[PDB]
Amino acid sequence: IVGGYTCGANTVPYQVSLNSGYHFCGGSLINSQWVVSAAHCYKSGIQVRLGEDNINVVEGNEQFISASKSIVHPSYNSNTLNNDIMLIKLKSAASLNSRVASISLPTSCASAGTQCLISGWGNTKSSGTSYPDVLKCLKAPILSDSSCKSAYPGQITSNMFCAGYLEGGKDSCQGDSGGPVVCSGKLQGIVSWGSGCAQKNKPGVYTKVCNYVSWIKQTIASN
Numbered sequence: 001i002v003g004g005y006t007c008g009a010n011t012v013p014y015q016v017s018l019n020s021g022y023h024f025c026g027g028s029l030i031n032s033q034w035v036v037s038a039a040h041c042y043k044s045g046i047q048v049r050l051g052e053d054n055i056n057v058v059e060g061n062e063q064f065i066s067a068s069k070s071i072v073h074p075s076y077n078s079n080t081l082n083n084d085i086m087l088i089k090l091k092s093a094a095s096l097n098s099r100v101a102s103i104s105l106p107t108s109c110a111s112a113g114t115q116c117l118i119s120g121w122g123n124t125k126s127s128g129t130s131y132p133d134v135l136k137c138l139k140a141p142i143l144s145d146s147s148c149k150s151a152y153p154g155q156i157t158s159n160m161f162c163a164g165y166l167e168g169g170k171d172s173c174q175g176d177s178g179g180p181v182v183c184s185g186k187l188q189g190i191v192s193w194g195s196g197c198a199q200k201n202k203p204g205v206y207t208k209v210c211n212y213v214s215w216i217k218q219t220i221a222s223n
């Protein structure tokens with residue numbers, strides 16, 4: 001996250017880190033047994049790490065749980081990043097507590113101008129490389145679909161939305177992929193792609209979760 005702030009430990013309790021020997025993607029806990037992330041985060045041998053703040057220090061509220069099953073969206077297209085969403089099932093149920101909490105699926109889509117919370121452990125500089133070890137947070141609004149389509153002609157689908165600031169300076173970035181975008185207490189977005197980070201007239205692009213709730217609910221009940 002570029003231009004954000006330190007969230008505070010476990011102030012974002014649905015936040016997970018996907019770990020394959022190292023942190024490589026964010027994710028969101030949606031119930032005690034299931035995590036949602038980005039399809040581009042797909043890999044084998046994933047361990048899900050819950051209750052994290054500093055991802056390099058064991059602080060006492062962590063739960064480390066291997067994934068039993070991963071399900072990439074059936075229509076995920078790696079070239080265009082359409083349908084950039086995946087479900088991960090935990091080998092054993094997480095223990096929910098103040099520090100580890102699930103986030104609610106939306107009942108409707110969010111409107112442009114709605115304020116959202118984006119979080120993650122990704123790079124914090126737009127120019128350089130600097131990875132934080134504590135969770136960073138950014139408040140950002142959903143942009144109008146026409147600002148979004150203007151920035152990225154021919155690349156935005158109905159399953160994507162843009163959020164951030166056209167002036168640049170504040171954005172998600174490398175290492176934040178798969179993480180949550182929470183607006184009005186509901187998961188509305190997944191960190192998906194962008195061009196650079198925090199560059200002018202290049203806002204972040206997010207998977208539009210409100211389009212997938214039926215698929216999510218049907219898939220978790222069948223697996």
Ligand SMILES: [Ca+2]
Pocket residue numbers: 052053054055056057058059062
């Ligand atoms: Ca830790």
